Design a protein around this ligand. Structure first.
Ligand SMILES: NC(=[NH2+])c1cc2c(I)cccc2s1
Lengths: 248, 9
């Protein structure tokens, strides 16, 4: 996240950190995600696309640091990895960039409620905040697009939602942004999501609840003028989410 | 206690 503040998971208790294991001894961070229900985390397909081998990913909940433990953190394996059929990437945008990960603990359980682990809410069918709403994004992504490492502390920032008319203007992204995407930026292009923040949440308050409005998906550069961050429009994927999620 | 979506504590 460029700009922002450093936070702890108590402030984003539904944030999930996804890592991949290497036949060598190292685990590296891949992307962020959000907890929807006890056993399901939602992230972005492009984070898995290149290596869809579920057994090599590990998911941690209750995590405030990247490679050091946080007391209260829970570790899970990916029991199911569901990528979106119709997922596409062009020279910028990713289309239908949403993925579901069913988690299982080594003891056979899903997440448990704590002060650092909570679920986030889902919007109702095609329901979004209006452009102008200030939403917050969180993640361990880059702090500068030229960095080659990720911060060790979780960060958060606030961005405002912008209309499609503004984002589809030629000097922004043209028709690369579709109705199934959302754009968010800082009025003064000072803070924004960036690489390593993919899959994480764009949370806004809708009808009283803190709702997962978008998933970090792409952007041209980070915190670049007239280059907003583009997010997957969750309110438009509800059927798809439903047809794959069940029980507690 | 139990999950209350969207709640920070
Ligand atoms: N400007 C942005 N909000 C973003 C830029 C990127 C980049 I560069 C890579 C992956 C995800 C994102 S989001």
């Amino acid at each position: 996240i460029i700009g922002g503040e450093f936070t702890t998971i108590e402030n984003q208790p539904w944030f999930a950190a996804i890592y991949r294991r290497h036949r060598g001894g190292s685990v590296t961070y891949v992307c962020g995600g959000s907890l929807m229900s006890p056993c399901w985390v939602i992230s972005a397909t492009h984070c898995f696309i290149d290596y869809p081998k579920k057994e090599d990913y590990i998911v941690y909940l209750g995590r405030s640091r990247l490679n050091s433990n946080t007391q209260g953190e829970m570790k899970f394996e990916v029991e199911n990895l569901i990528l979106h059929k119709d997922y596409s990437a062009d020279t910028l945008a990713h289309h239908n960039d949403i993925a579901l990960l069913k988690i299982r603990s080594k003891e056979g359980r899903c997440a448990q409620p704590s002060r650092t682990i909570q679920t986030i809410c889902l919007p109702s069918m095609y329901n979004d905040p209006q452009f102008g709403t200030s939403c917050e994004i969180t993640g361990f992504g880059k702090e500068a697009s030229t960095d080659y490492l990720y911060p060790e502390q979780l960060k958060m920032t606030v961005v405002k939602l912008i209309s499609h008319r503004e984002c589809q203007q030629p000097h922004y992204y043209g028709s690369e942004v579709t109705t199934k995407m959302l754009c968010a930026a800082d009025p003064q292009w000072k803070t924004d999501s960036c690489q390593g923040d993919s899959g994480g949440p764009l949370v806004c308050s809708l009808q009283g609840r803190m709702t997962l409005t978008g998933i970090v998906s792409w952007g041209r550069g980070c915190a670049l003028k007239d280059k907003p961050g583009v997010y997957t429009r969750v309110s438009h994927f509800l059927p798809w989410i439903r047809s794959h999620t069940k029980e507690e | 206690l139990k999950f209350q979506c969207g709640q920070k504590t």
